[PDB]
Each structure stands twice: as structure tokens, then as C-alpha cells.
CSV table of C-alpha atoms in Angstrom, one decimal:
chain,number,residue,atom,x,y,z
A,1,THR,CA,135.2,67.6,99.0
A,2,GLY,CA,137.4,64.6,100.2
A,3,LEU,CA,137.5,63.8,103.9
A,4,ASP,CA,135.2,65.9,106.2
A,5,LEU,CA,137.4,67.5,109.0
A,6,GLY,CA,134.3,68.9,110.8
A,7,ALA,CA,135.3,71.2,113.6
A,8,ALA,CA,139.0,70.5,112.9
A,9,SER,CA,138.7,72.4,109.6
A,10,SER,CA,139.7,75.8,111.1
A,11,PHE,CA,142.9,74.5,113.0
A,12,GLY,CA,146.4,75.1,111.8
A,13,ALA,CA,147.7,72.9,114.7
A,14,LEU,CA,145.7,70.5,116.8
A,15,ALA,CA,147.3,68.0,119.2
A,16,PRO,CA,145.8,66.3,122.3
A,17,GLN,CA,149.1,66.2,124.2
A,18,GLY,CA,150.3,69.7,123.5
A,19,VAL,CA,152.1,72.0,121.0
A,20,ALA,CA,155.7,72.8,121.9
A,21,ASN,CA,157.2,75.8,119.9
A,22,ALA,CA,160.6,77.4,119.5
A,23,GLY,CA,161.2,80.6,117.5
A,24,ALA,CA,159.1,83.0,115.6
A,25,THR,CA,156.3,80.7,114.4
A,26,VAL,CA,153.2,82.1,112.9
A,27,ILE,CA,150.0,80.0,112.9
A,28,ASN,CA,147.4,81.5,110.6
A,29,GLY,CA,144.5,79.4,112.0
A,30,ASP,CA,143.1,78.1,115.2
A,31,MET,CA,145.3,76.1,117.7
A,32,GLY,CA,144.1,73.6,120.3
A,33,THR,CA,144.8,70.7,122.6
A,34,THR,CA,142.6,68.4,124.7
A,35,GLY,CA,143.9,70.0,128.0
A,36,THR,CA,147.7,69.9,127.7
A,37,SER,CA,149.3,73.4,127.9
A,38,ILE,CA,151.1,74.9,124.8
A,39,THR,CA,154.6,76.2,125.2
A,40,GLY,CA,156.7,78.7,123.2
A,41,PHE,CA,153.9,81.3,122.5
A,42,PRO,CA,155.5,83.8,122.6
A,43,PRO,CA,157.7,83.9,120.7
A,44,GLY,CA,155.2,81.9,118.5
A,45,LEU,CA,151.9,83.5,117.7
A,46,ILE,CA,148.6,82.5,116.3
A,47,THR,CA,146.2,84.7,114.4
A,48,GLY,CA,143.1,82.5,114.9
A,49,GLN,CA,141.5,81.3,118.1
A,50,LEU,CA,143.2,79.3,120.9
A,51,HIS,CA,141.0,76.4,122.1
A,52,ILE,CA,142.7,74.6,125.0
A,53,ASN,CA,140.3,72.0,126.3
A,54,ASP,CA,136.8,73.5,125.5
A,55,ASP,CA,133.9,72.1,123.5
A,56,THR,CA,135.6,73.2,120.2
A,57,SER,CA,138.8,71.4,120.9
A,58,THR,CA,137.0,68.1,122.0
A,59,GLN,CA,134.8,68.1,118.9
A,60,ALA,CA,137.8,69.1,116.7
A,61,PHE,CA,140.0,66.3,118.0
A,62,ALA,CA,137.2,63.7,117.7
A,63,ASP,CA,136.5,65.0,114.1
A,64,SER,CA,140.3,64.8,113.3
A,65,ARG,CA,140.3,61.1,114.4
A,66,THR,CA,137.1,60.4,112.5
A,67,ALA,CA,138.8,61.7,109.3
A,68,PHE,CA,142.0,59.7,110.1
A,69,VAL,CA,139.9,56.5,110.3
A,70,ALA,CA,137.9,57.3,107.2
A,71,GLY,CA,141.2,58.2,105.3
A,72,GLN,CA,142.7,54.8,106.2
A,73,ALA,CA,139.5,52.9,105.3
A,74,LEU,CA,139.3,54.3,101.8
A,75,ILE,CA,140.0,51.8,98.9
A,76,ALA,CA,143.2,52.8,97.1
A,77,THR,CA,143.0,53.8,93.4
A,78,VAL,CA,146.8,53.5,93.1
A,79,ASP,CA,148.8,50.8,95.0
A,80,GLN,CA,152.4,52.1,95.4
A,81,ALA,CA,153.2,49.1,97.6
A,82,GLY,CA,156.9,49.4,99.0
A,83,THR,CA,157.7,52.7,97.0
A,84,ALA,CA,159.9,54.7,99.4
A,85,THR,CA,160.1,58.1,97.4
A,86,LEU,CA,157.5,60.8,96.6
A,87,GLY,CA,159.8,63.4,95.1
A,88,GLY,CA,160.0,63.9,91.3
A,89,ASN,CA,156.4,62.7,90.7
A,90,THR,CA,153.4,64.4,89.3
A,91,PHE,CA,150.2,62.8,90.8
A,92,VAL,CA,146.6,63.2,89.5
A,93,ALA,CA,143.6,62.8,91.9
A,94,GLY,CA,143.6,59.5,93.8
A,95,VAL,CA,143.9,57.4,97.0
A,96,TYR,CA,147.6,56.4,96.9
A,97,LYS,CA,148.5,53.4,99.2
A,98,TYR,CA,152.1,53.2,100.6
A,99,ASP,CA,153.0,50.2,102.7
A,100,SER,CA,156.2,51.5,104.3
A,101,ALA,CA,158.2,54.6,105.3
A,102,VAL,CA,158.1,57.3,102.6
A,103,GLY,CA,160.4,60.3,102.0
A,104,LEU,CA,160.0,63.5,99.9
A,105,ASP,CA,163.3,64.8,98.6
A,106,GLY,CA,162.8,67.4,95.8
A,107,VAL,CA,159.4,68.4,94.4
A,108,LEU,CA,156.1,66.7,94.3
A,109,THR,CA,153.5,68.0,91.9
A,110,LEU,CA,149.7,67.6,92.5
A,111,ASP,CA,148.0,67.9,89.1
A,112,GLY,CA,144.3,68.8,89.3
A,113,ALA,CA,144.0,68.0,85.5
A,114,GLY,CA,141.7,71.1,85.2
A,115,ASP,CA,139.3,69.8,87.9
A,116,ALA,CA,139.3,71.9,91.2
A,117,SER,CA,137.2,69.1,92.9
A,118,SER,CA,140.3,66.7,92.5
A,119,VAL,CA,141.1,65.0,95.9
A,120,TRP,CA,144.4,63.4,97.0
A,121,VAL,CA,144.5,61.0,100.0
A,122,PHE,CA,148.0,59.7,100.7
A,123,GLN,CA,147.7,56.5,102.8
A,124,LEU,CA,151.2,56.3,104.4
A,125,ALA,CA,151.2,53.1,106.5
A,126,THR,CA,154.1,54.4,108.8
A,127,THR,CA,156.3,57.5,108.7
A,128,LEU,CA,156.4,60.6,106.4
A,129,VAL,CA,159.8,62.4,106.3
A,130,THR,CA,160.2,65.5,104.0
A,131,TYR,CA,163.8,66.6,103.3
A,132,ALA,CA,165.3,70.0,103.6
A,133,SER,CA,164.0,72.5,101.0
A,134,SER,CA,161.5,69.9,99.7
A,135,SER,CA,158.3,71.3,98.2
A,136,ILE,CA,154.8,70.3,97.2
A,137,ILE,CA,153.2,72.3,94.4
A,138,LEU,CA,149.7,72.5,92.9
A,139,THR,CA,149.0,72.7,89.1
A,140,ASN,CA,145.9,72.8,86.9
A,141,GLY,CA,143.4,73.7,89.6
A,142,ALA,CA,144.7,71.5,92.5
A,143,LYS,CA,143.6,72.9,95.9
A,144,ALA,CA,145.6,72.4,99.1
A,145,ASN,CA,142.4,71.9,101.1
A,146,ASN,CA,141.7,68.8,98.9
A,147,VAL,CA,145.0,67.1,99.9
A,148,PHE,CA,145.2,64.7,102.9
A,149,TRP,CA,148.4,63.2,104.2
A,150,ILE,CA,147.2,60.2,106.3
A,151,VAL,CA,150.3,59.4,108.3
A,152,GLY,CA,150.1,56.0,109.9
A,153,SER,CA,152.7,56.9,112.7
A,154,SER,CA,154.6,60.2,112.8
A,155,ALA,CA,155.5,63.0,110.3
A,156,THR,CA,158.8,64.8,110.2
A,157,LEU,CA,158.7,68.0,108.0
A,158,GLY,CA,162.3,68.9,107.0
A,159,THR,CA,164.1,72.3,107.5
A,160,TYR,CA,162.8,75.0,105.1
A,161,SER,CA,160.5,72.5,103.4
A,162,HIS,CA,157.1,73.5,102.1
A,163,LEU,CA,153.9,71.3,102.3
A,164,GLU,CA,150.4,71.7,100.8
A,165,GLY,CA,147.6,69.8,102.5
A,166,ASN,CA,146.0,68.5,105.7
A,167,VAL,CA,148.5,66.4,107.7
A,168,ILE,CA,146.5,63.9,109.8
A,169,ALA,CA,149.1,61.9,111.7
A,170,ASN,CA,148.3,59.0,114.1
A,171,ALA,CA,151.1,60.2,116.5
A,172,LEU,CA,153.7,63.0,116.4
A,173,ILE,CA,154.0,65.9,113.9
A,174,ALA,CA,157.4,67.6,114.0
A,175,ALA,CA,157.9,70.7,111.8
A,176,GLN,CA,161.7,71.4,111.7
A,177,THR,CA,163.2,74.9,111.4
A,178,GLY,CA,161.6,77.1,108.8
A,179,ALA,CA,159.2,74.5,107.4
A,180,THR,CA,156.1,76.1,105.9
A,181,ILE,CA,152.6,74.6,105.4
A,182,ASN,CA,149.5,75.7,103.5
A,183,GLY,CA,147.2,73.3,105.2
A,184,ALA,CA,147.0,72.0,108.8
A,185,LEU,CA,148.9,69.8,111.3
A,186,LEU,CA,146.4,67.5,113.0
A,187,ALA,CA,148.4,65.2,115.4
A,188,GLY,CA,147.3,62.2,117.4
A,189,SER,CA,149.9,63.0,120.1
A,190,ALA,CA,152.0,66.3,120.1
A,191,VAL,CA,153.0,68.9,117.5
A,192,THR,CA,156.6,70.3,117.7
A,193,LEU,CA,157.3,73.5,115.9
A,194,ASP,CA,160.5,75.6,115.2
A,195,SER,CA,160.1,78.9,113.3
A,196,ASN,CA,157.3,77.6,111.1
A,197,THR,CA,154.4,79.2,109.2
A,198,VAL,CA,151.1,77.3,108.9
A,199,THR,CA,148.3,78.9,107.0
A,200,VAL,CA,144.9,77.1,106.9
A,201,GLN,CA,143.4,77.0,103.3
A,202,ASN,CA,139.7,76.8,102.1
A,203,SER,CA,138.0,75.2,99.0
């Protein structure tokens, strides 16, 4: 249902070049790297399995990149061209193409329109920045596990923000103080965390 994440599907945080944590983070999911050590656990903790450079982390990373490539290759159903803002919108299922840096200030609503099989793929050509206390919400049967944020460079999740979905970034994912995620942080470089909660979702 949407992009196949393969062995990456159980990970809350996956980054080849490490996960660097500050504060009382809780990862409800697996965590891995391709060999780089993680730092800041404790005081962080994970409730799933740690996979630092084993067969699972190699296959999970490869699968995360396969999904990134497939996500970028999809034909857009909605061309948003140079639109810079996501906040204050209600989006039905689609592949949404954004050509430049996007921000989310306020609330974004993902409307399943009564169909739980609804898929969202956000094709963000460069950066994603979510603002402080921003939120993504699900209505009318939308499922977090069917939402994909395909971030063309790096994602910055703002302080005390809330995100639903699978963040598949080409490079860095930074979750600022208190950001919460129902989904996953699948980075192409590093993940930085500060007092976050990440909970992996199923569909």
C-alpha cells in the first residue's frame, strides 16, 4: 500500500552516518545505522531492536533508498510547482510535486475520503521545514503508514511539532526539541534528535 519500505518498515530511525540524541527521547521502533555509532542513548531509549551494522541494517538502508528512488520516480497527480506552504490545506490521496523549499506552519489535514487504502506521496524537491507546534492530522480513514514525505535534501521538524508519516530524506533529518512523529525517520545521512517521540505505525 504505497511505497514498499521492505526491511526499513520496522525502523523509527535509520541513518547510515549515525543517530545523535539529546534528552529523554523515546523511539517506539527499531533503530539502526550502517556502522556509525549512535550517541545519547541514554538518556534516549528505544523499545524495538537496535541494528548497528548487521544484515538487517544493510537491507533496511538499501530498502529505504529503493523507496526514495521509487518515490521520486512516481508521476505526480497534483503539480504544486513553486508553492512554498503546506499549512492550512486539506489533501486527498495523491502524488504532490513541490519544486522548491516547503514549510508547514499550522495544520495540514490528510483526508482519506473514507478510503483507508488512500496513499500520499509528497515529492519535495529540496528542504522540508515544519514550524513550532505545527501538526499533521488524519481524517476519514487516512493512515499514517500510507503517508510518505520524500525529502529531496534535508528535513527540519520544528520544536513541539507533530508529524504523521514516513520521512524518507536524501540527507539529514533533524527533529528539534519535543517534536513527535507517528511514522519513521529514514535519513540518507544522519538523524539528530532532541527529546522526541517516534512511534512506528502499521496499515
